[PDB]
Write a protein that binds this ligand. Structure first.
Ligand SMILES: CCCCCCCCCCCCCCCCCC(=O)OC[C@H](COP(=O)([O-])OC[C@H](O)COP(=O)([O-])OC[C@H](COC(=O)CCCCCCCCCCCCCCCCC)OC(=O)CCCCCCCCCCCCCCCCC)OC(=O)CCCCCCCCCCCCCCCCC
Ligand SMILES: CCCCCCCCCCCCCCCCCC(=O)OC[C@H](COP(=O)(O)OCCN)OC(=O)CCCCCCCCCCCCCCCCC
Ligand SMILES: CCCCCCCCCCCCCCCCCC(=O)OC[C@H](COP(=O)(O)OCCN)OC(=O)CCCCCCCCCCCCCCCCC
Ligand SMILES: *C(=O)CCCCCCCCCCCCC
Lengths: 177, 79, 13, 155, 62, 171, 128, 122, 65, 459, 87, 275
């Protein structure tokens, strides 16, 4: 439905996602580890019973009413991981995630507090500014006519060149700034 | 720097409630694969935790003994 | 040891 | 920004709808404008009335906190449907059953408080007995006058 | 400068607030109004010396 | 200090220290420590400042407004006399405000000073407050934001006609 | 059997309950592929400007400018006076004014009648 | 909590209502009934600044207990004796209120027996 | 020496935290039983509550008619 | 008052005879000296107004507005000297001269003894504001902004011109001091009804009244910074000043003719605050907030109790300082992202912490946090309207709820959340911008210590 | 709080979890042991492996990235990218 | 005040029974105690309510601090379903959390006794709304239920947190900060309630069932929630009810009124106000 690489979820992907959501909401219903492990192997056997169903329509039907069974038997407040979206510590440190370009606007009396760091930042920005036009001309020699098809980015194929559109992935802030 | 791990072999589930879980799964032709991962919660220094009525009575022995000592002290003090 | 540089905006001004 | 990339009038021909859908960067069949009834929308698209909480949060969004892409058309209430405001996320329980349970519980509690006010609890005693004629000079009575004697006896 | 905290943060503000309340607040009427102290049977008024007489003898209960 | 007639106080009657228990209270030692550390040097600084006040003594005064003719004996549309009448009435209105404030301060000081027995032992201040509020309400209430001695004289004439009709309907 | 989920305006339908999610029909394949093509074109067009070292400024989003120009500037030129908007503008624009007019007028007539007949408790009221 | 069920779920004419009572004269049934002595003088409990809920017929023990609590500072447990005296006299005053309640209950039972004997005889 | 993290096992305990925990739990049970030994009327009851049915008629002013 | 009019006129040879790099420094310096001198108007008395000459007087209503007017000129010079840094020198001196000429018209608008001279100055203040908006404005629709500015302010003021001359022919004078003592009760008739409307609708446009307010979220939006500052700080307050002068003559017909305008303002303070909850444009949000706060001043003038006029003048001074600071904050971010869209650049506390503190202070003074004079004005108007009718407390408290909501939503949207990834020209805060914020907020915070100077003629 | 992770520590812990899973014998497991082709595991078993990684390291791996990790070296590198180790 | 406080202490302590985040549960605990304070204001006992403020400060601050020590020792794990096995792992935190729970429920002669027990003893013996008193007693049971819920899922049982143990609490800041409130929650109720002057006349004469009522309903809540706790280890998988979905989804009032009322004030503000 909504994915970065492809446009859809396959049938096998929806089976695996229902399996994972069913185990997580089961663990939310079944707090203790051993009781969860008992009912989790029971649910795993319930999945593996119709593992070899060759009819795609019958497999889609069993997946659909399995989603119905799951929607009835879900936990109201499922355990969300804390840094996962919906958790308690999700996007908590984003107020400390200052982007990298703010170092360039420092006064020189506080750029002199870290001479080796900015003496290295200059050669990082040098590497970026001599990689930019080569990776742009890499992008326009590989993109098909009518635009790109998927959102998947191509790698660097040559030696000496860097992968295209790499600066805000390599120089992103840390999870604990 | 280096963090050493304890040996993976020692987390056998014989002696845990995972043993009872694997017995009730073998009662219907099933085999539990994820027992030894969860074995550490039911072994070692976390095994044999207290119940609630013993968790309330933590320090009840020493506290009651000091109670008896201090009541005897104020009983022998008043004369 | 292994101290990390903290990116923060310009506190001079 | 230029004039043929601004919102314009309501499209009535299919080629005007095609130019509008190309302007708003979306497919023509998915391009549903608001109905032309004077509410001031023009050719603006009717995004399907969801919040931004329902969006896939692990996607590498152009606008992460908005869960929004660059060039993707925005809902007319995009500032309303942010995660700092109204959530239209699906609930485990239906909306009507939630309204039934909450209204029934509140109304039942209010009725039982009123009935318990109608039938109070008390103790098997008389009123408290106060000297100096129910504390007349203490409750602010005027000392030029003299009230009735409130005499309390033994029992 | 070893207990400079208890000097600078206490003993100088006690001086300032005591000078303030003593020569600019209580010299103005009804600024610091105090509830009058509680008089019992058996006390002695420090302004007069009159001993407040004790209560009537109790109809003892136990 | 101030005038003890306009801000009256009942005589202070504190009880004597009658200790019973064997333990010494902390408050006598805290009082003597506060005395020897604070109450003496603050007094010494005030004595030095008082000497510097006594080195150059000079006086300020209270302004006296003599009574000019009021609005009842000023001609209609005669701004030279009714300006004086209006300034006189505005100063009297501000002084009446401060009278009501003084009686409020008496009432509140009595309520706190009497504590729990305030409902009994502050009937005099409550009576004075009710009288001065009834007078201020009959005199200046509902005149509005554009109040004047003309507005107050018109209110007084309407109230006097109401009282005259209330007296005439009782005889 | 199981209680069927009832989608409302404030609680939409989950994707795991939608019947039209599991359509493997090729018009849905083409629609998802064309939406993916549009989204990929806009994604590449964004991050070409976003990863540029020569840019020091705002990557302007024409959808945002278009959103603000819709929310502010395109209201009167695409308004038409019809029955719905007229009854809404008289129902909601002059309606509460008339309602609060009657409420505050009735309250002030009642209070002025109680004052000019000498019934309203106005003993200590001297601040107004 | 049985008289609650005797006033609510049975009949209400025989149970004494809490809000307006006593409905009988204090001399109705008592040969030479005596008043309650007020031990604390009015100016005394005016000077000790007692709460108006606490200015009842047993305020002299409360005056002595507050005087003890002041005179035994900082020893806040040295006046358990006067506190027990005040609390036991509050207990006795509550007993007197219970006796007023039971008096009114038995006199309403007397009115019920009177009207039933009159409805049987006449 | 600060506490070093272990793995899938019971963590290293200080002597001090365990003796303070036992000390305050023993102080809790001491204080509860001590105040139960002294007061015993704030829990159970201060005075006997009299039965209104057991009362006589003469103390309540009941002429038998 | 001539001792302030003559230095304001000497600011013109001070700005036209300066060196080309010295035209901001000299005008800022000498306008700060004139604002230093403006505090000599505080010689007020409990009975009498400070009556200078036949032409000028200054009671305790005009005095805080005069101090605010003479203080606002250096702040406008500081605020406008960055976006005009690439302007022609002659046009730059013309901009400074329009600001000085506007100050000159304002400071003898507030001191006009006679009401047709008040009218002449009150309508003379339009034309520098006209030139500022429709010369140094930003976008395409600045010419429709001033056209609806000039049309609404003249179509309201035109029956006021006939009404003041009708007072001149009937009473004999338009001196306010004479009409204090020669005012006659205006009875119930249709002639006196349209008389009341002619005397009031001009200032109803200038406040603005709800329903007549549609010039303002274009005239404030399409203005430059000095124009928006002077519009939200003084030119809205000219209506409250004129109403407080003109309701002396309109009694007792106000006591039953004020009801529909009290309804319009009491409901428009709810409507425009709800509109502030859904503005995509930050400068529009501050504009509709200005309408929502001036609605209370309209209610407090139309119910004409002493607490109401005290709260209304306190609220005018407080809102002038607060809204001027909020427009300067919005310009400080517009000088970096070049867009007034509020949802564009977020998370700005992660990049500008001290400016986020100034945003926080301006937001707290926006929602009337005690003990600010914002809350003093808000609270006194609420007290007087509760005395007026007890049911109005619902509308007042509901307005205060929505006020705190849009204030803190503006704070959250502009200052908090995740910052924008594709915006990288966010400079550190200049010393000029923080000087502008501090010279707004520090007088507003100091006026909480001694609030009696901004509480009008009947304190 | 929160001791720092290394590639050695993540590798040791991921192989430690995969040596406690009964469908993998401990001698055939390596850093590059692909789960489907080499180790003979199922897709569902690989999903449970990802869930064991989530329970081990205390964060959710999304399904679009869970369904692409098909060897322990990719799992270690993905946790290394999501936690920024060797800083 | 009596009806509103009884409604608050019923609804919040009933919503606390099936929440999963520990800070949510202690927030419903303090809101239920504030409802009890509103109740005892409503029975004309203002000084008992203020004494219960001063009492409640110590142990409810201590319970939030113990939950914070648990959260920091489990790396921002705020959910009670990933806790447990912390009896010996965090002994000082276990100790102070149990002492705070007993002070919350009304253990005899801790700090919470001298306020809450007199609140219930004065709420029984007064001319009172009877349904309000009954809901107050139901809330009194619910306090013991969620207190042993916090102790059970947080401390008792076996671990559920992830495998890397970072459990550490041996810093004198944390130890002294919980220690001084621990001394407060042990002694300050006795100290304050025997330093305060008498401002009302306390009801000390009452029948035996009516004197023991708070303690009895508290212990019965303990017993019923011990049954609820022991029915978790069983190998039974119960489908959720409507009472569980009511108390687990916050009573549906933070669900509807945080969607319905912000819908109207945001759409009428444009489609009927702005546009
Ligand atoms: C006449 C003589 C008078 C002398 C005394 C002065 C009287 C008050 C004047 C104003 C004082 C504050 C001015 C500076 C603060 C604003 C800028 C700022 O935050 O800079 C941070 C900076 C330090 O922070 P940083 O770490 O570097 O950077 C901050 C970060 O960026 C991150 O920023 P942040 O968010 O962490 O920091 C912002 C923070 C944000 O804080 C908040 O949001 C919390 C505030 C609200 C709640 C608490 C207060 C509620 C009200 C109760 C208290 C008032 C009444 C008390 C009386 C008893 C009760 C009635 O604000 C503060 O910390 C300021 C503390 C004081 C707040 C006052 C109230 C502001 C609230 C809004 C209005 C409320 C009503 C009006 C109250 C008026 C009181 C006079 O401060 C300074 O550098 C201060 C510079 C010097 C200031 C001089 C002030 C006087 C100027 C007047 C000149 C003429 C007279 C001569 C007097 C000379 C005195 C030396
Ligand atoms: C003593 C008597 C007591 C009587 C009590 C009973 C009567 C009153 C009943 C309550 C009425 C008000 C409550 C309803 C509105 C609640 C609004 C609110 O807070 O919404 C919360 C919502 C976010 O909630 P959520 O989705 O859970 O957040 C998850 C985190 N991402 O937040 C959002 O969606 C953000 C929305 C921002 C703008 C909201 C606008 C709503 C304004 C409401 C004003 C109400 C005025 C009432 C006036 C009464 C006058 C008498
Ligand atoms: C304080 C007095 C405590 C002793 C009197 C109450 C005894 C009681 O009713 O205990 C019930 C119960 C213990 O017995 P139970 O758990 O049901 O049986 C299995 C063996 N533990 O459960 C308990 O005793 C646990 C609850 C104790 C609550 C203490 C604080 C009040
Ligand atoms: C009759 O029962 C009078 C007592 C007060 C009213 C009833 C109170 C019932 C609840 C308290 C006792 C609970 C015993 C488990």
């Amino acid at each position: 439905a909504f994915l970065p690489s492809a446009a859809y979820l396959t049938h096998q992907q929806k089976v695996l996602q229902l399996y994972k959501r069913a185990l997580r909401h089961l663990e939310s219903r079944c707090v203790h580890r051993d009781k969860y492990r008992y009912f989790a192997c029971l649910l795993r056997a319930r999945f593996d019973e119709h593992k070899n169903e060759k009819d795609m329509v019958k497999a889609t039907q069993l997946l659909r009413e399995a989603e119905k069974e799951f929607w009835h038997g879900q936990h109201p407040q499922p355990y969300i991981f804390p840094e996962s979206p919906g958790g308690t510590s999700y996007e908590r440190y984003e107020c400390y995630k200052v982007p990298e370009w703010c170092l360039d606007d420092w006064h020189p009396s506080e750029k002199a507090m870290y001479p080796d760091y900015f003496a290295k930042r200059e050669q990082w920005k040098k590497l970026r500014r001599e990689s930019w036009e080569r990776e742009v001309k890499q992008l326009q020699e590989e993109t098909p006519v009518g635009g790109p098809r998927t959102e998947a980015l191509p790698p660097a194929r040559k030696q000496g060149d860097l992968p295209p559109l790499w600066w805000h992935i390599v120089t992103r802030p840390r999870e604990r700034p | 720097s280096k963090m050493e791990l304890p040996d993976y072999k020692q987390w056998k589930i014989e002696g845990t409630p995972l043993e009872t879980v694997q017995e009730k799964l073998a009662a219907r032709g099933l085999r539990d694969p994820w027992g030894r991962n969860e074995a550490w919660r039911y072994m070692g220094g976390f095994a044999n935790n207290v119940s609630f009525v013993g968790a309330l009575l933590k320090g009840f022995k020493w506290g009651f003994a000091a109670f008896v000592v201090a009541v005897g002290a104020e009983y022998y003090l008043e004369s | 040891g292994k101290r990390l540089f903290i990116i923060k905006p310009s506190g001079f001004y | 920004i230029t004039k043929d990339m601004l919102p314009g009038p309501y499209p009535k021909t299919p080629e005007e709808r095609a130019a509008a859908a190309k302007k708003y960067n979306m497919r023509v069949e998915d391009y549903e404008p608001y109905p032309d009834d004077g509410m001031g929308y023009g050719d603006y698209p009717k995004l399907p009335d969801r919040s931004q909480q329902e969006r896939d949060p692990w996607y590498d969004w152009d606008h992460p906190d908005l869960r929004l892409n660059w060039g993707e058309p925005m809902h007319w209430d995009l500032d309303m449907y942010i995660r700092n405001r109204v959530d239209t996320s699906p609930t485990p329980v239906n909306w009507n059953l939630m309204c039934k349970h909450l209204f029934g519980f509140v109304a039942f509690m209010l009725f039982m408080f009123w009935v318990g006010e109608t039938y109070p609890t008390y103790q098997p005693v008389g009123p408290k007995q106060y000297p100096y004629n129910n504390l007349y000079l203490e409750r602010g009575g005027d000392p030029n006058k003299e009230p009735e004697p409130v005499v309390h006896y033994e029992i | 400068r070893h207990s400079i905290f208890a000097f600078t943060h206490v003993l100088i503000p006690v001086w300032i607030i005591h000078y303030y309340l003593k020569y600019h607040v209580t010299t103005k009427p009804y600024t610091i109004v105090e509830k009058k102290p509680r008089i019992f049977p058996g006390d002695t008024i420090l302004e007069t010396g009159e001993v407040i007489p004790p209560m009537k003898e109790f109809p003892d209960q136990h | 200090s101030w005038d003890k007639d306009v801000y009256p106080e009942p005589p202070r009657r504190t009880p004597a220290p009658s200790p019973q228990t064997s333990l010494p209270n902390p408050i006598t030692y805290l009082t003597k420590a506060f005395d020897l550390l604070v109450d003496r040097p603050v007094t010494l600084v005030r004595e030095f400042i008082e000497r510097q006040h006594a080195k150059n003594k000079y006086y300020y005064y209270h302004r006296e407004f003599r009574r000019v003719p009021d609005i009842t004996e000023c001609h209609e549309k005669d701004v030279l006399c009714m300006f004086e009448a209006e300034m006189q009435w505005k100063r009297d209105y501000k002084v009446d405000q401060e009278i009501v404030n003084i009686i409020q301060e008496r009432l509140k000081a009595c309520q706190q000073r009497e504590g729990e027995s305030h409902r009994q032992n502050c009937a005099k201040e409550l009576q004075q407050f009710t009288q001065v509020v009834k007078a201020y309400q009959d005199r200046y209430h509902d005149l509005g934001a554009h109040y004047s001695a003309r507005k107050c004289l018109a209110k007084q004439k309407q109230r006097m006609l109401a009282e005259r009709k209330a007296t005439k309907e009782a005889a | 059997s199981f209680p069927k989920y009832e989608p409302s305006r404030l609680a939409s339908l989950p994707t795991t309950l939608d019947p039209a999610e599991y359509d493997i029909s090729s018009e849905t394949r083409k629609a998802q592929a064309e939406r993916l093509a549009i989204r990929s074109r806009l994604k590449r067009e964004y991050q070409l400007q976003y990863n540029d070292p020569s840019r020091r400024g705002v990557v302007e989003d024409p959808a945002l400018i278009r959103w603000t120009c819709a929310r502010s500037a395109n209201v009167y030129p695409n308004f038409r006076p019809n029955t719905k908007t007229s009854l809404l503008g008289a129902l909601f624009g002059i309606g509460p004014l008339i309602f609060w007019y009657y409420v505050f007028k009735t309250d002030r007539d009642r209070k002025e009648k109680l004052i000019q007949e000498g019934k309203l408790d106005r003993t200590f009221n001297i601040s107004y | 909590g049985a008289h609650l069920a005797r006033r609510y779920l049975g009949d209400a004419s025989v149970e004494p209502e809490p809000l307006r009572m006593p409905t009988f004269p204090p001399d109705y049934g008592f040969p030479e009934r005596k008043e309650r002595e007020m031990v604390a003088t009015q100016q005394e409990m005016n000077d000790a600044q007692l709460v108006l809920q606490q200015r009842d017929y047993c305020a002299h023990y409360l005056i002595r207990f507050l005087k003890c609590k002041r005179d035994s500072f900082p020893n806040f447990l040295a006046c358990k004796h006067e506190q027990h005296d005040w609390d036991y006299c509050e207990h006795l005053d509550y007993v007197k209120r219970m006796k007023e309640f039971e008096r009114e209950r038995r006199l309403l039972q007397r009115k019920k027996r009177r009207e039933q004997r009159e409805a049987d005889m006449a | 020496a600060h506490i070093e993290p272990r793995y899938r096992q019971f963590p290293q305990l200080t002597r001090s935290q365990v003796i303070q925990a036992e000390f305050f739990s023993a102080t809790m049970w001491f204080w509860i039983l001590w105040r139960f030994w002294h007061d015993s009327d704030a829990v159970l009851g201060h005075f006997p509550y009299p039965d209104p049915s057991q009362w006589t008629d003469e103390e309540l002013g009941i002429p038998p008619d | 008052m001539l001792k302030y009019i003559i230095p304001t006129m000497m600011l013109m040879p001070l700005t036209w005879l300066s060196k080309n790099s010295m035209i901001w420094i000299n005008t800022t310096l000498h306008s700060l000296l004139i604002s230093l001198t403006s505090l000599l108007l505080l010689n007020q008395f409990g009975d009498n107004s400070l009556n200078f000459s036949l032409t000028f007087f200054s009671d305790s209503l005009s005095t805080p507005l005069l101090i605010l007017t003479m203080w606002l000129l250096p702040l406008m010079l500081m605020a406008s000297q960055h976006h005009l840094s690439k302007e022609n020198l002659a046009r730059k001196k013309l901009f400074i001269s329009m600001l000085i000429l506007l100050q000159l018209f304002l400071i003898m608008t507030f001191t006009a003894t006679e009401l047709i001279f008040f009218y002449i100055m009150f309508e003379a203040t339009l034309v520098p504001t006209l030139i500022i908006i429709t010369r140094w404005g930003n976008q395409t629709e600045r010419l429709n902004a001033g056209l609806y500015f000039l049309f609404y302010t003249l179509a309201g003021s035109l029956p006021l011109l006939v009404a003041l001359i009708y007072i001149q022919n009937t009473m004999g004078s338009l001196n306010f001091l004479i009409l204090q003592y020669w005012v006659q009760p205006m009875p119930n008739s249709w002639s006196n009804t349209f008389m009341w409307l002619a005397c009031m609708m001009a200032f109803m446009v200038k406040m603005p009244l709800y329903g007549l307010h549609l010039w303002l979220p274009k005239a404030h939006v399409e203005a430059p910074i000095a124009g928006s500052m002077v519009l939200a700080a003084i030119l809205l307050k000219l209506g409250g000043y004129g109403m407080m002068r003109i309701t002396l003559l309109l009694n007792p017909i106000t006591d039953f003719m004020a009801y529909p305008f009290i309804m319009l303002s009491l409901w428009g303070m709810i409507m425009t605050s709800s509109i502030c909850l859904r503005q995509t444009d930050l400068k529009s949000l501050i504009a509709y907030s200005s309408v929502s706060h001036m609605a209370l001043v309209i209610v407090a003038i139309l119910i004409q109790t002493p607490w109401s006029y005290m709260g209304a003048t306190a609220l005018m001074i407080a809102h002038g300082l607060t809204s001027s600071m909020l427009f300067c904050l919005a310009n400080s971010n517009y000088e970096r992202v070049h867009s007034r869209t509020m949802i564009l650049a977020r998370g700005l506390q992660t990049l500008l912490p001290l400016m986020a503190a100034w945003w926080l202070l301006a937001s707290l003074t926006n929602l009337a946090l005690p003990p600010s004079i914002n809350l003093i004005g808000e609270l006194f108007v609420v007290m007087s309207t509760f005395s007026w009718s007890n049911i109005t407390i619902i509308l007042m408290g509901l307005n205060m709820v929505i006020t705190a909501l849009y204030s803190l939503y503006m704070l959250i949207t502009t200052q908090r959340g995740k910052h924008t990834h594709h915006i990288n020209n966010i400079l550190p805060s200049f010393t000029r911008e923080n000087a502008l914020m501090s010279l707004h907020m520090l007088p507003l915070l100091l006026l909480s210590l001694n609030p009696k100077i901004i509480l009008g003629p009947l304190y | 709080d929160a001791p720092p992770l290394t590639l050695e520590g993540i590798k040791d812990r991921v192989l430690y979890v995969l040596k406690l899973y009964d469908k993998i014998d401990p001698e055939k497991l390596s850093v590059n042991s692909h789960f489907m082709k080499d180790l003979g595991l199922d897709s569902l078993d690989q999903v449970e492996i990802i869930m064991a990684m989530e329970d081990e390291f205390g964060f959710e791996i999304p399904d679009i990235d869970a369904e692409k990790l098909m060897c322990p070296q990719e799992i270690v590198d993905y946790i290394a990218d999501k936690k920024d180790v060797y800083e | 005040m009596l009806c509103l406080g009884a409604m608050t202490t019923l609804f919040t302590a009933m919503c606390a029974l099936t929440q999963n985040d520990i800070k949510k549960i202690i927030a419903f605990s303090t809101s239920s105690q504030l409802g009890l304070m509103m109740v005892t204001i409503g029975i004309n006992q203002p000084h008992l309510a203020f004494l219960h403020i001063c009492t409640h400060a110590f142990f409810k601050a201590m319970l939030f601090m113990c939950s914070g020590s648990i959260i920091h020792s489990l790396n921002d794990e705020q959910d009670i379903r990933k806790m447990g096995g912390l009896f010996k792992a965090m002994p000082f935190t276990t100790t102070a959390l149990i002492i705070g729970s007993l002070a919350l429920t009304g253990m005899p002669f801790l700090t919470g006794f001298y306020s809450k027990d007199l609140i219930i003893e004065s709420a029984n013996t007064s001319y009172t709304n009877a349904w309000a008193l009954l809901m107050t007693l139901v809330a009194t049971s619910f306090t013991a239920i969620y207190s042993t819920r916090i102790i059970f899922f947080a401390l008792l049982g076996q671990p559920r947190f992830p495998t890397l143990i970072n459990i550490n609490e041996n810093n004198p800041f944390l130890i002294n900060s919980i220690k001084r409130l621990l001394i407060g929650s042990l002694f300050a109720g006795f100290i304050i309630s025997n330093n305060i002057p008498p401002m009302t006349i306390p009801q000390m004469t009452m029948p035996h069932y009516l004197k023991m009522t708070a303690l009895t309903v508290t212990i019965l809540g303990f017993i019923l929630a011990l049954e609820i706790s022991n029915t978790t280890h069983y190998l039974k998988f119960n489908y959720p009810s409507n009472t569980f979905k009511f108390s687990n989804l916050l009573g549906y009032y933070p669900t509807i009124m945080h969607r319905l009322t912000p819908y109207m004030n945001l759409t009428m503000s444009q489609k009927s106000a702005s546009s």
